[PDB]
Amino acid sequence: TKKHLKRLYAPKDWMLSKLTGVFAPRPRAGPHKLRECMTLMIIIRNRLKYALNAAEAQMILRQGLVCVDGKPRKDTKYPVGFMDVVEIPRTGDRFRILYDVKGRFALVKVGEAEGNIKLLKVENVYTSTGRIPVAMTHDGHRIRYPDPRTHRGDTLVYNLKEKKVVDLIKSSNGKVVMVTGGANRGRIGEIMSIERHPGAFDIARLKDAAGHEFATRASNIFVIGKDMQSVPVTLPKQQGLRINVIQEREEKLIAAEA
Amino acid sequence: QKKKAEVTVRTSQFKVNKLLNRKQFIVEVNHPGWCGTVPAKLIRSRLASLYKVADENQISVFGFKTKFGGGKTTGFGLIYDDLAALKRIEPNYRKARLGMGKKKQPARKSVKERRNRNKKIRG
Amino acid sequence: MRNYNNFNRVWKAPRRPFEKERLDREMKLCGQYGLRCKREIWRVNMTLSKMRRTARLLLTLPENHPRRQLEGSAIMRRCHDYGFLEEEKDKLDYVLSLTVPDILERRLQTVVFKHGLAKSVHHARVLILQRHIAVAKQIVTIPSFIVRVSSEHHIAFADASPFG
RNA sequence: UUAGGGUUCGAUUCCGGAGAGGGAGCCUGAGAAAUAGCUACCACUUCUACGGAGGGCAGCAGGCGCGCAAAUUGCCCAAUGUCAAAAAAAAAAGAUGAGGCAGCGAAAAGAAAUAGAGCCGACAGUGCUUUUGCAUUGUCGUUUUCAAUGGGGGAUAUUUAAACCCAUCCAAAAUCGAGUAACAAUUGGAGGACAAGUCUGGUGCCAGCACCCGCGGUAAUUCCAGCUCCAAAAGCGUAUAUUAAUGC
RNA sequence: GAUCUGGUUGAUUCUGCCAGUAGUCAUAUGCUUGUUUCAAGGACUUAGCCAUGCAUGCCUCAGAAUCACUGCAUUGCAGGAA
């Protein structure tokens, strides 16, 4: 059982430094995996800057002033992965974490009624006792009584105001879809095709807007909406389009002349 | 003599932190013609007039970084709302520069030695 | 343990140090530009060899290669800065025509003298280190500070200076 | 370390495995065949009014031994993490030789002081020249002279958990200080390889030098001294291993 | 920097090693140092033996207080040992 983590062996999507400190926090197990998560203390301290020190993050959280999933937390360490709404009511602000283009955690700011919306990808379906069907998700949530049309790897729109599931969205056909992991993170596009290799990983080919096709694993597909004009949730800072190295450098210079 | 030295204090990026009820403001200093480093007393006075605080008690500042060549300094400071909020929320050392800190705990070593001997006793 | 700070050498001694050819072309510099010791002449040599390595490697490549495109503009850009080459240069063969003096020439020690603020290079090295020079408004007391093409026209003197 | 191909190293900060004097066995626990948990044997080892009872530093310091060879029985939980019933504070601030800080530290690595300038005299080179003379550049020198600054001293202070280091300053009314700038650079070389002596004294196949080639038998460019000059420079020699040199 | 310099001979051209040569967070060692910035540091020779001290304990608003424990209170409250 591991209870310690070193800064280098920790993700640098948390944007820790080589120098200053030796350890990084190992979060308590929860909805999300160690690599894909970002621990509370990291967010509050290094990004939002409502804390300058570890101890100050305990001060805020133990007390309680912070909610995720609309539930208040007294937890110092807790995962925050993907499609999680966090709300600090003291500020009155609602963040929705996502994957920004270029592999960065996005923190995107939402209207208040969008922060009751959430999207969870389904992993398995199975029948449990009493013939009661269950969809188990990638956040470990159990949706009792899902629709009879549910399949593995589809999204379920999930009301956090009161817990239930309205209409689903499938991974079928061309639909607006975004990537999770694999270093095509936050890049958005239509499904062009879904290749099958049975007994092995199923490739899928995505085509983003303004062309430039590419390939990513089925496992890394996470649906957004029916269409780009039917999206239920906001996009991060960049729209889900990447640009060439040359153009990055060019634009960096142009703005620096101001 | 040929001049009067003055201490100029400014600020750059400001926060309102309602969670801890404090302000977080990156200070700048300039201090043209001032001899040596600027004592923190002056800075507290300038900041008082600037943010319309009636106290240098609520103003508590830590760290100052003197850039190479000439009189220059930059730093960071904290204003709090109430004086009760200050005492409670803030670290011991920061407070004790104002003289609002707590008395130091007895030496670490003597604690250890005694804390061991307490494991032996039954009452 | 647990140190994650790098160390690197910036200077190295050329092979066969008793070549009377090399000795000539050392003293010629170190006396003229007022350099402290040979270590300085070598320090610039290294950084120049480095630059010239990547430029050679880029030049090899066919046109419209990403390495060529991106990193070509960068090498050129930073020789426009510091005034090593002018803005009529683009080839990455110009970059390979750089030699040791053109570096030394743009060090603060020489730039001070050449702009008319000292009477010798030796004398301008003192003017630096007695904290009585600036490079726009920032007091620099290092003679090996390489001066931008823009900022060699704003040198002035320190505001701590009895000469200013 | 190498242009390339390669060559060689990995005890050691991160990840993985294994171990806690040598072996084996076991309990508890979700997880252990745990060793600052237990049981036994063996090699050691500490107390005892000798009836008995203990010990395991390859945890941090420290001691002995070992070898060519390696730091303080220091300060702190402020930071970074962890453990917990646990936010802080309220009379009222949990623990941590994990970890941070300082001491010691020419392994290694970055920056940089030991001077700079005007007059006079001497020397060399170039141009013009009536050969008298003039101009320019560089060097050296006197009881020559002029400014400026750090090393160092101190603080209205500041850094830090506390205190230092760095930095900023010598009044803002009020605060130090170089002229042989004694605040004085050394370690190896000058026959060849290999940058630098047509030197002077001493020694005379002795003493010694010499990686190698070779020097020394009274005429030493190499030894032992002095002066002179050279290379690198706050670093420079020597030993061993390894890589380049090697298409050996 | 894709580097061949001395040594076999009366003199010469080869083969061929030896010696010279530059690096090493690679260790030891001699001599010498006025400051700053950054650091490895009992691995190598015995995973040899160890004096002494210290190195994981922990409770709020919320599991158990009649310390014959302390204050405020006067058959009521708050701290609070182990």
TrEMBL record, chain A:
Record Pfam families:
40S_S4_C, KOW, Ribosomal_S4e, RS4NT, S4
| GO terms of molecular function | rRNA binding; structural constituent of ribosome
Identify the PROSITE patterns for this entry: S4
Give any single GO term for biological process.
translation
The record places domain RNA-binding S4 at 39-102
Keyword annotations for this protein, in alphabetical order, are: Ribonucleoprotein, Ribosomal protein, RNA-binding, rRNA-binding
Q: Which InterPro entries match?
A: KOW, Rib_uL2_dom2, Ribosomal_eS4, Ribosomal_eS4_C, Ribosomal_eS4_central_region, Ribosomal_eS4_central_sf, Ribosomal_eS4_KOW, Ribosomal_eS4_N
Q: Which SUPFAM superfamilies match?
A: Alpha-L RNA-binding motif
Q: Which residues form the KOW domain?
A: 170-197
Which family is this sequence assigned to?
A: Belongs to the eukaryotic ribosomal protein eS4 family.
PANTHER family named in the record: 30S/40S RIBOSOMAL PROTEIN S4, SMALL RIBOSOMAL SUBUNIT PROTEIN ES4
This protein's name: 40S ribosomal protein S4
What is the protein's species of origin?
Answer: Trypanosoma cruzi (strain CL Brener)
Starting at the broadest rank, the lineage of the source organism is: Eukaryota, Discoba, Euglenozoa, Kinetoplastea, Metakinetoplastina
TrEMBL record, chain B:
This protein's record includes keyword Isomerase: no
Q: Which UniProt keywords apply?
A: Ribonucleoprotein, Ribosomal protein
Q: Name one Pfam family in it.
A: Ribosomal_S24e
Q: Which GO terms describe its biological process?
A: translation
One GO cellular component term of this record is:
ribonucleoprotein complex
Gene3D superfamilies this protein is in? 3.30.70.3370
Q: Where is this region: Disordered?
A: 95-123
Q: Which InterPro entries match?
A: eRP_eS24_sf (IPR053709), Ribosomal_eS24 (IPR001976), Ribosomal_eS24_CS (IPR018098), Ribosomal_uL23/eL15/eS24_sf (IPR012678)
Recorded GO molecular functions are: structural constituent of ribosome
Q: Is Ribonucleoprotein included in the keywords of this UniProt record? A: yes
Q: Which domain of life is it from?
A: Eukaryota
Instruction: Please report which protein family the annotation says this sequence is part of.
Output: Belongs to the eukaryotic ribosomal protein eS24 family.
Official protein name in the record: 40S ribosomal protein S24
Q: Which organism is it from?
A: Trypanosoma cruzi (strain CL Brener)
Automatic annotation (TrEMBL), chain C:
**This protein's UniProt keywords:** Ribonucleoprotein, Ribosomal protein, RNA-binding, rRNA-binding
Please give the coiled-coil regions recorded for this protein.
none
The Small ribosomal subunit protein uS4 N-terminal domain sits at 5-105
Q: Which GO terms describe its biological process?
A: ribosomal small subunit biogenesis; translation
Q: Which InterPro entries match?
A: Ribosomal_uS4, Ribosomal_uS4_CS, Ribosomal_uS4_euk/arc, Ribosomal_uS4_N, S4_RNA-bd, S4_RNA-bd_sf
UniProt GO MF annotations:
rRNA binding; structural constituent of ribosome
GO annotation, cellular component aspect = cytosolic small ribosomal subunit
Q: Does the keyword Transmembrane helix apply?
A: no
**RNA-binding S4 domain mapped to chain residues:** 106-164
Claim: Ribonucleoprotein is one of the keywords in the record? yes
Q: Which family does it belong to?
A: Belongs to the universal ribosomal protein uS4 family.
Extract the PANTHER family matched here.
30S 40S RIBOSOMAL PROTEIN (PTHR11831), 40S RIBOSOMAL PROTEIN S9 (PTHR11831:SF5)
User: Could you identify this protein by its name?
Assistant: Small ribosomal subunit protein uS4
> Source species, please?
Trypanosoma cruzi (strain CL Brener)
